[PDB]
């Protein structure tokens, strides 16, 4: 136990004899008092106590006594002076002076850890001022004041006491001077258990701070901390710590906290303040080290040498991406820019940190100070699409915090974030910069474990096992699983399994990794999911990129699974030279793991805030539609594709740039955003807007694209393979791209789909067949049946939809949400007109029609039929016809081709009812604007009808005009004659009679509630339920 020593000497010289002889009662802490209040000795009293300690440097050391105090009682009421020597050599800590060690704890100081401290002279022994300069950067220079109060009087005592103590601090800061100080702080600790409560003390707080405030502003004082107690709650204390900061020339910052244990073993800052909970510092330890200026700079640099922004710099990257989002929209849409919220107030974020019962809590604290290798925020961004506000979650790893590795704490956090984004419906964005899961060994068992050899003299003769000494075995026991086996007559505890105290070494990390891997897989299908490769995303991190589906890769950041050197070691030779040689953009964007490639960390954010513009703010919320604004809805589609040559299909979607002017596409000018344009370029996937209505687009590339698969370095006998993916055909990769895109616009994104169908089938070739073309063909069908929002399959001019292709895109796949249209000059059959001709219109069938239309051939036929001509005569008719038919054959072939093409024509399609309407490409925009809008408002009204009615397809005939059995009831409530058609008239009706539908829904809701009540021996049960 720490033995207490107290000795009251009479003199300074005679005090030495009560040291060397008083230490003899020690087989700890020692105090020495004096009776010479003659002079207020300083420095010379320090040169009068140092000779007694440097001489007995081994005397105090041997007894193992830690602290040595020197109290000096003054006869005028003066607070006695105390001097303490601590440690091995007892160097005398200048920090604890003129105050008892018990008071040290009360003085704090463990909060000025990130500072070089040098104290200064104080006229009042109670107050202590310190010069503080940031350990790293010298630009920071501050004066911290530390005062502790304890009474001498046997109600409004404390408020009058406060005036005396703060005036004393102000008068001392005056003599030391304001000098050159960036910030100044003062702490006033109260030892008192006063019976009163902070609510009245806050009213009185306001009173004296406005008087002292002006003076405090001059000294350059930024904040003051008062630490009082309130015994009336039980009559158990409520320690109320209060911080008052002078931010903006006027205080207006009174943060009223409460000292409570977080359950985790730390005392935290739980505030019940009056600055409207949107302030600083909440559920933070009392041990926070008052950070310096530029304290973020070392961490910033560490992230920047890895080529990534420091994690806490990302919220401001998002503010500027939104800032840019308005500056560009005010250009395109002038006037309607009045809702711009300035440079600040763009976004309104709040940190997320694991709560008391591990339930995420919204905190607004200092950047940095992250307890775990992961951080999150709930951001309310005022986008021009949702100018009132829109929320989303942003999760990211701290690449400085243990190279950003995934430990169990990091996992539980990431999870509880995904869990929240789901619970709110708001999208989730992950900023990846990690090092997979955490590795680790038990460090404590490294300098303690023993080895049992076969031969102790020559250890190279193999070792039997590894054991632990009995004294070192009792030290752990729960950190190691040991078996006892006596060898050489020793109690040897052989290590049979190592556990280790510390977490995050092995399997505990894999378990958590698996949890979040599944959580991300689940989330993708519910809320909008997105990832960003801001830096190397390895192992589990690499998978959350794929489970997160929608990924953006910064050019020089790899999505690696197994380390580039780890692979070289496995092969035994230096095959791979870079982590990007197998993880980089040239792999992931070129195989479709990456949807977009961004030049830098900000370019990434920018591109993300771009997808979020297309996506509804919540889960089941209406799309971010705007006024027609740049490209009006009432404009005709100018670019029309040629029938001769090939065309960049992109020109049909947004528009073609030309020498003379610009011919627009069917979507809004430059609203198209192509994704996965590095993988299976035979299909163009992207998002675009149609008169303000955002929607998903899939189109077919007509030009013969060539993907060149790279050479494998692992096999020196591997060369790059030149493969030409001929345009307008479906290949394993193209099919996969299509299918993926569909599910991506389906889950979370919730977008209507536009499919400019132009494929002439599937790749039936041996190589493509073996490459599972059939597997990925199915994936399109599977994906289409899962969809909910409207899908429009529109065959464009020149566009084809032959056999294999048509089957996997037909509206009877999902009749409830699909709608098929075909262009007036489009074609669609079972086979190409060049392909049917050698099956239904063979050589013999063409000659029967030749001996019908051609006059020469049927006249020569009349010669053979009449007979009466010899062997040399019949040869003439044969050599006359088999010359005529030889020259007619090429044009007669083309006749059947045109004949067969008249079957494949659009008209036939409407006649057999496989399409709704024939469409003129010129006015496609004008038609789809009102058909997309009509379907979107109607789909929801029907969804609402069903939700009111039931609180819980069948034929080739199924056409969208009957997609729901309620479209008959809604038809009669509306009253429009041309209901199935006149899309514009319908939309405008709903908009006007918004109140009449909600009138009819409530009528139906009360009617459906009456059915459920009635559906609920049975009579006896009901009687009993009535009695209850």
Author numbering: 1186 to 1212, 1253 to 1379, 1386 to 1464, 1469 to 2187, 2196 to 2259, 2300 to 2311
Study authors write:
Biotin-dependent acetyl-CoA carboxylases (ACCs) are essential enzymes that catalyse the ATP-dependent carboxylation of acetyl-CoA to malonyl-CoA.
Using molecular replacement based on fungal ACC CD and CT models, we obtained structures of a variant comprising CthCT and CDC1/CDC2 in two crystal forms at resolutions of 3.6 and 4.5 Å (CthCD-CTCter1/2), respectively, as well as of a CthCT linked to the entire CD at 7.2 Å resolution (CthCD-CT). In all these crystal structures, the CT domains build a canonical head-to-tail dimer29, with active sites formed by contributions from both protomers. The connection of CD and CT is provided by a 10-residue peptide stretch, which links the N terminus of CT to the irregular β-hairpin/β-strand extension of CDC2. The connecting region is remarkably similar in isolated CD and CthCD-CTCter structures, indicating inherent conformational stability. On the basis of an interface area of ∼600 Å2 and its edge-to-edge connection characteristics, the interface between CT and CD might be classified as conformationally variable. Indeed, the comparison of the positioning of eight instances of the C-terminal part of CD relative to CT in crystal structures determined here, reveals flexible interdomain linking.
